[PDB]
Amino acid sequence: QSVQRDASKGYSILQQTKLFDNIIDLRIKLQKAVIAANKLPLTTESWEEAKMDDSEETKRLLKENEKLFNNLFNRLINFRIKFQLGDHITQNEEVAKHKLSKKRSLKELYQETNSLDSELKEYRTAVLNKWSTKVSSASGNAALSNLPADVQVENQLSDMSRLMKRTKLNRRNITPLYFQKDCANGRLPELITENPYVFDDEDFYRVLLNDLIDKKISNAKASKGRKLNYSVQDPIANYEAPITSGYKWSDDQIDEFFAGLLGIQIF
Amino acid sequence: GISRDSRHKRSATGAKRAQFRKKRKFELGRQPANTKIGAKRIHSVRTRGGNKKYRALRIETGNFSWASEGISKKTRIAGVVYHPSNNELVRTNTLTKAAIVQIDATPFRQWFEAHYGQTRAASAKIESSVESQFSAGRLYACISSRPGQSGRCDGYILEGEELAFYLRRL
Amino acid sequence: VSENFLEKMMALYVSSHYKNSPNDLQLMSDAPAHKLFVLLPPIDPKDGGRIPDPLCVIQIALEGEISKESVRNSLSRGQRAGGDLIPWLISQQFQDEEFASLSGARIVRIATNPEYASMGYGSRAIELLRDYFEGKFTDMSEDYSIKRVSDKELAKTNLLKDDVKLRDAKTLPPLLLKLSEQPPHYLHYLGVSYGLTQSLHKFWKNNSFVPVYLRQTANDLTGEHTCVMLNVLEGRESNWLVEFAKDFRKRFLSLLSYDFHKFTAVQALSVIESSKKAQDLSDDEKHDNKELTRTHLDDIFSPFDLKRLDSYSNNLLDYHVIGDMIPMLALLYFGDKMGDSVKLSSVQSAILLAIGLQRKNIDTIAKELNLPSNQTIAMFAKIMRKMSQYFRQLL
Amino acid sequence: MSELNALLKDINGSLTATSESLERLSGIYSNSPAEKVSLLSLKNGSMLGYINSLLMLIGNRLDDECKDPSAMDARERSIQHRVVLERGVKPLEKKLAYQLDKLTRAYVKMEKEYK
Amino acid sequence: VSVYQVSGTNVSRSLPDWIAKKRKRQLKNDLEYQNRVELIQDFEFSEASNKIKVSRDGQYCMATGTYKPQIHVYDFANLSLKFDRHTDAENVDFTILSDDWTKSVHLQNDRSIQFQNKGGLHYTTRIPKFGRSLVYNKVNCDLYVGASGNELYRLNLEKGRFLNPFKLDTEGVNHVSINEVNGLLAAGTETNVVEFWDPRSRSRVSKLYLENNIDNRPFQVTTTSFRNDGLTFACGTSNGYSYIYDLRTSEPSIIKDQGYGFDIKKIIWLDNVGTENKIVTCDKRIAKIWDRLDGKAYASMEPSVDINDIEHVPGTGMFFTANESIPMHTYYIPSLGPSPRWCSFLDSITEELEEKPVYSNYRFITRDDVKKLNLTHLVGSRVLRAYMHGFFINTELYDKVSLIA
Asked: Which residues of chain C have a CB within 8 Å of the CB of E344?
């Protein structure tokens, strides 16, 4: 019985790991979008001038862009409700079910995201504290009593200023459309190479690509003798004599090894 | 110790003939030469009379003839692909007469593009299968010279019914 | 059910031992430090919970955590308190007070099924045991104390009407506990003690243990010299171990003449090799060997001596002529002063170690390595040629 | 072609491709008592939020108005999610990595035995 | 590490040996010709050599030739050819039954087993179908012959009787090998499976399916070999991948890539030499030495001519290799162990020896395979160090791109 629960736990472990890899595939597909977005204009005047170049086609493209975007992010939010529901991250099952049923607007969609991240933060605090204690006890760190993981996350989130700069770093050297015209016109207050407007997660993106890559590596007729004649053959008779010693291993051992070859409450 | 004497065989009637005389020189046979693809290695043989024979123990190059255009070029042999007598000769890349081998297509392609200026049209037309082989980069040819005896491995590129039949057999 | 298992444990525990005494049973049962660890084959659910057989039985004794006051008072008094063998000995041999404070466990005994010796169960057993203390084993699913006989019960029972009974099964914990169920005790090192033999040392060496001490006087009953080997678990300071290992190696080299001349050349060479592996353990460069300085070389050897070595490298000398200087060469090479320029094969190292340190004759090593005497001297000659060429490079 | 039109096409392809893969992923999760590892559950859930925050960074930019071109709010959420994966989740699972591998191996052996 | 070529051709790979014989008369004046040392006289065949083995006693060696197909036997105690003996057809494999050279069995290529006794050809028998390998079971005196067909033939030397042939599930046996400790027979089938058999009974203890993740291509088991420890087991594939298996568990403990994509021709276990954890996996072009535990390369032998067989003199650091060249090469890696007793003074001349030394360290890739892997964009980069007609990549980086591709 103990075997089965462990085996089932592995399936959940595998399922979560497969779930991890799949979502990275989503991130990989989205990668050309984030680079493209960082190339988009930053200001109303640039966008209108961007539309000015091809007004008709851009309007059609913009209409398709808005539809696909809203459909996608409405769908993602549906998964998050289900995902955080299915995994017990959200405790209010009734509220989660109504949200899935109801269709939401863009303003409404942002609100659920705020709600969803808020719930994950509470779950995050509980989970890290639970496992950090468990790891501590296992290693004897409890006996010793190296910061708690939740505390470490709190400190890094406290240093929000440092890490914002990490995003602002323009490693790829992306120039958004009409960036020079917005700079010359003083339409970019933040700036007045590190660009606040360009977002760079390339290092984070590469590390995810590597980890996915390494895991894949780690897991990965009678004539001419054509009919056999069983007669005695004199010249080869008694050609060599068998050794009386036999196999150096004892027979029972040899029999044993072959069998396994190729693979009070006591417990 | 190989012999070609007809005495050790049985008669037509089935009688087991007795040994008349010890083995003689004029009834000699020598060990076979298992020609293989590899750096040209030839061992000479002093045969009956002043004549001489060359054994092609290893060889990589041969003269091959395109009969349709009546041309001959020296080409490298890539490997044995099919051999009518036995297939374990096909496996070990053993080279012998009638073997079907794959030869490099470069010089024939060069000659063709030179002579006809194509990669007028009617003459330049060639069999579709041969053209596909050119696109592949290797051509199917049949060895027509006995490597064991003369020491060379010349042959001809397959074509027509030859080519259809052997491609089917492949 | 427990008793059936205890008999199986003693069978494995007693099999290897030459002559076991019944004290050790009391020793296992009552000692608070001692713990017992059993490797078991995979359990088949079809077996209906039959009392399984033990393949490898390990007994560990927790030791250390000695106050820096007590060690000094005892060391000056020269008195050895009972227990804590490895701390007290290593404290004496090195006069280090910091080691006695560290928390460690001595592997009192390891035994495997003799029918199954030499197939990797014993090694597997140690590998898990280290992982148990290191902290790898954790429970993922989100008490084992037994209530003692209360004083109230003792007063309410009379000698005549005492009903002495086995403890009720609900009270008793399970016989076998999964590693994750029981937390470990925090430890810095794991130590062993065993008579030095080629097989055993090869086993310990493969398990990443490091020698730190070797008793000079062979045990009378066995003819073997007691050896102590230490290992440091991941995540703990490793400096103190490395200093001992370096210090021991120097001690071993000089003593090869005195009382370890008996050891086979290969056997002795292994001991140095095992200790050197400790150096590779420390990826730091704070402690490194120092190459021979030109001033140091002049004090060790006179220029004529270097010339004399040079002549031998050119074959213009008899072998006996250079007999004087070899032992000094041996210490410099095995002290690693010579540096990266001079490196030798295993056969050459054994030959040099023999003549230089064991003080054995060339003829004896020719037998001991089963080589012709002529080939031995030749291989020796190439060694001097490398050393001579090096001394030329320094100059 | 305008630079925007080529870019807008690039986004259009991604959003379609991402949506279809999401549709596949939602089906398999919907297809799935089995209890999951909470730490890994957070790990998946957190990085899901990271993608959402990235999309809000895309969404903020895609707007022609561009009231928040820096996408500071979307940045902070991506910042919050990224930290948990790198600083919190990763050290713990490395400690737990040994026991994880043992269990997954155990099932695969049983699954091999069953077949 | 230092590898010395005691004997063997020392010309360019492009230069064939026979011209060196023609150059030999012209270069007689050259001093190096006088100084060069040949260890065994006539240690050479007319055109090529097929197999090489050393008698158990340690004083005699035997070899086979291409034309005229012949059988040298070398006497180490005299550093000389003892006798050459011609045959009817070229050799495919043989074994030396006796401890000395006197007693041997040779499986030719015309499907005939010839029993060579000391005097001369004793008896010639024929197996039903073509043979590919030959092993001898000292315990039962039963000689086992691999065959193109499924059935694995059995010949009993004691009884002088063909016995019931074993029946394999698949057709084609490329190599057979008998574990000394246990008697387990391993049969290397053409398909990617190795079938184990019990000799005392006649059964199939189990079949191991070889799985390579890197390359989806089909591969054939070409060689097998049991270590004296009686537990570990080695396999070769036609894709140039050498596996080390602990028999008990189905998973491959280590997979090492030779990287030239050539079939593995022999595996030798260097346990006897000391520092037991080493192994040799010999290819058509390279014989690499590496350690069984870590997989790190120890030494490599890179002869100028194709390797057909390699042999290790027990208890010593010497290696013989039968090549497609006129001379058979002899190597000597001093680090492994002492020179053999008969080569007592080989150490003396080490400096005069050639001392031959990237190619073993990295994985070789053809131009076409680069296209298959979409690595064209890196051509000219420091990752791709081009040699000959192909490009070298780090083995780890090769594993990465292949799975992605």
From this structure: 372, 374-375
Neighbours of C113 (CB within 10 A): 17
Q: Is D29 an 8 Å CB contact of chain A?
A: yes
- Whether the CB-CB separation of E182 and A254 falls below 8 Å is answered with yes
Strands B155-157 and B61-66, sheet pairing: parallel
Chain B residue with CA closest to E19: the answer is B41
Instruction: Spell out which chain B residues touch chain E, with contact meaning CB-CB distance below 8 angstroms.
Output: 1-2, 30-34, 38-41, 43, 55, 57-58, 88
* Alpha-carbon D33 to chain mean position: 25
Residue C163 — left, alpha, or beta (φ > 0 → left; ψ -120 to 50 → alpha)? beta
What stretches of C93-199 adopt beta strand conformation (E)? Answer: 103-112, 189-195
Resolution in Å, one decimal, please.
3.7
Alpha-carbon distance D70 to D75, whole Å? 8
Is E284 in contact with E273 (CB distance < 8 Å)?
no
A-chain residue closest to D30, CA distance: A82
Asked if C touches B (at least 3 Cβ pairs < 8 angstroms), the answer reads no
Does the distance separating the beta carbons of D96 and C138 come in below 8 Å? yes
Question: What are the residues whose beta carbons fall under 8 Å from the beta carbon of E72, sequence distance 6 or more?
Answer: E42, E45, E62, E63, E64, E65, E81, E82, E83, E84
Q: From CA C192, how far away is CA C60, in angstroms rounded? A: 9
Q: What CA dihedral angle connects E321, E325, E327 and E328, to 10 degrees?
A: 10
How far is A205 from chain E, CA to nearest CA, in Å?
Answer: 17
Can you tell me the distance from the alpha carbon of A120 to that of C106, in angstroms, rounded to the nearest whole number?
A: 47
Pick from C130, C274, C276, C133: nearest CA to C200: C274
The C-alpha atoms of residue E130 and residue E107 are separated, in whole angstroms, by: 10
Q: Tokens for E156, please give them.
A: 């009993």
Q: How far apart are CA E272 and CA E278, in angstroms?
A: 10
Look at the block and give the residue holding tokens 């069978």. Answer: C11
Sheet of E185-189, strands arranged across? E173-178, E185-189, E193-198, E203-209
Q: Can you read off the two tokens belonging to residue A39? A: 């190339």
Interface test with C, best of E232, E348, E350, E355 (most C CBs within 10 A): E348
Cβ distance of C369 and E348 shorter than 8 Å: no
- CB neighbourhood size of E237 (10 A): 24
Give the CA count within 13 Å in the CB-facing half-sphere of C322.
Answer: 30
Q: What's the gap between Cα E370 and its chain centre? A: 29
Q: What is the DSSP letter of A232?
A: B
The approach used to solve this structure was cryo-EM
Cβ-contact E86, E69 below 8 angstroms? yes
- And the tokens for C308? 């004399």
3-state secondary structure chain E: CCEEEEECCCCCCCCCHHHHHHHHHHHHHCHHHHHCCCCCCCCECCCCEEEEEECCCCCEEEEEECCCCEEEEEEHHHCEEEEEEECCCCEEEEEECCCCCCCEEEEECCCEEEEECCCCEEEEEECCCCEEEEEEECCCCEEEEEECCCEEEEEECCCCEECCCEECCCCCEEEEEECCCCCCEEEEECCCEEEEEECCCCEEEEEEECCCCCCCCCCCEEEEEECCCCCEEEEEECCCEEEEEECCCCCCCEEEECCCCCCCCEEEECCCCCCCCCEEEECCCCEEEECCCCCCEEEEECCCCCEEEEEECCCCCEEEEEECCCECEEEECCCCCCCCCCCCCHHHHCCCCCCECCCCCCEEEEHHHHHHCCCHHHCCCCCCEEECCEEEECHHHHHHHHHHC
Amino acid sitting at position D41: S
Packing angle between helix C346-353 and helix C326-334, nearest 10 degrees?
130
User: Can you tell me which residue has the tokens 């590390």?
Assistant: A207
The token duo for E196 is: 């184990």
In this structure, are residues A21 and A212 in contact, taking their beta carbons and an 8 Å threshold? yes
